[PDB]
Amino acid sequence: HHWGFGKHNGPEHWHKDFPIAKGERQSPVDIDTHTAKYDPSLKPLSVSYDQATSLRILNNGHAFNVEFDDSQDKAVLKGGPLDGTYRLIQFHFHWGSLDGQGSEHTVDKKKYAAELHLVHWNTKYGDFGKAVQQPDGLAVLGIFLKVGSAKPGLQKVVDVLDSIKTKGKSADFTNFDPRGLLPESLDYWTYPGSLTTPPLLECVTWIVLKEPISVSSEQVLKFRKLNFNGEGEPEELMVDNWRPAQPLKNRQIKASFK
Ligand SMILES: [Zn+2]
């Protein structure tokens, strides 16, 4: 027995094992576009993924992560509301059982079909494990996905899901360019938050892009064929692996545009 997204171990139950679930800077949150404040002080985001080295894709029971070599500054995020350099370590998605839900953050209560999270850690802390213990340890880039035209750069990811259908399975996944997943514009909102699944640490500086990226119904459908369970166990489709919006509390969402 452990946390998950079922009826008996879902988000509403997490607080019992992870008290921080009721913390002061929990994520995700609803972005009210009319209360977000434009901040001219915010610099443009600097995404340098030209030297990114993807290594593997794995199904960890609650999503699938596409891991990168973070032993050097190969793929980094700088600028924006960030101080210092943040290295990309992995990216994953959260999606729903229907196209009308799936994203974690919502914009004016609007839910998207899915949400892509590119996780980066602050190099000043040495390693990922140390970074999660700091208030400015991680910087996650969030991108919304809407159902429409297919996204060419995502197909490579879609085609390998068959090999990692169940929990614990992994597959070599080299030479994948994450630049194919970015929208045209880099305008964003940002606020201090946390990791949206246990252990829900409040070490995140969220940077959610305003412009969604379109994927076809066929591409999202393949996400829904994954399993939460391990091989040989009863099948339970991996869908609705998103946490609902949490109270904003004493936080301000800033926008890089107006
Ligand atoms: Zn995530």
Distance CA 248, CA 253 (A): 9
Q: State whether residue 256 is helix, strand or coil.
A: coil
Which of these, 143, 146, 258, lies nearest to 206 by C-alpha position? 143
* Tokens read off for 134: 């700091």
Residue 38 CA to ligand 1 centre (angstroms): 25
Distance in angstroms (rounded) separating the CA atoms of residues 184 and 34: 23
Q: Which residues partner with 188 through β-bridges?
A: 209
Give which of 174, 181, 186 is closest to 155, Cα–Cα. 181
Contact 213, 151 (CB under 8 A): yes
Ramachandran region, residue 201 (left: φ > 0; alpha: ψ -120 to 50; beta: rest): beta
Beta-bridge mates of residue 78: 46
Residue (of 16, 18, 253) closest to 142 by Cα position: 253
Amino acid at 1: H
92 contact partners, CB below 8 Å, separation of at least 6:
63, 64, 65, 66, 116, 117, 119
**Is the separation of the CB atoms in 94 and 83 below 8 Å?**
no
Strand partners, 116: 93, 143
- Distance, in Å, from the CA atom of 151 to the CA atom of 103, rounded to the nearest integer, reads 17
Ligand 1 centroid to residue 143 C-alpha, Å: 10
Does 117 belong to an annotated binding site? Answer: yes
Active-site residue, 13 included: no
| 253: amino acid identity, one letter | I
Residue 218: CB partners within 8 Å, gap ≥ 6? 150
How far, in Å, is the centroid of ligand 1 from the Cα of 6?
17
15 marked ligand binding residue = no
Q: Distance (Å, rounded) from C-alpha 204 to C-alpha 103?
A: 18
Record the tokens describing residue 60, joined without a space: 């960890």
CA 247, distance to chain mean position in Å, is: 19
Q: Does 196 show up as a binding residue in the annotation?
A: yes
Structure tokens at 118: 């590119």
Return d(Cα 177, Cα 50) in angstroms, integer. 8
Q: How far apart are CA 58 and CA 49, in angstroms?
A: 21
**Among the options 1, 15, 34, 62, which is catalytic?**
62
DSSP state of 237: B
Q: How far apart are the C-alpha atoms of 126 and 4, rounded to whole Å?
A: 30
Query: CATH top-level class for 1-258?
Result: alpha beta
Q: Token digits for 207?
A: 């940077």
DSSP codes joined into one string, 155-223:
HHHHHHGGGG-STT-EEE--S--GGGG--S---EEEEEE--SSTT--S-EEEEEESS-EEE-HHHHHHH
Placement of tokens 């229907």 in the chain: 98
The H-assigned helical ranges of the chain are: 128-131, 155-160, 217-223
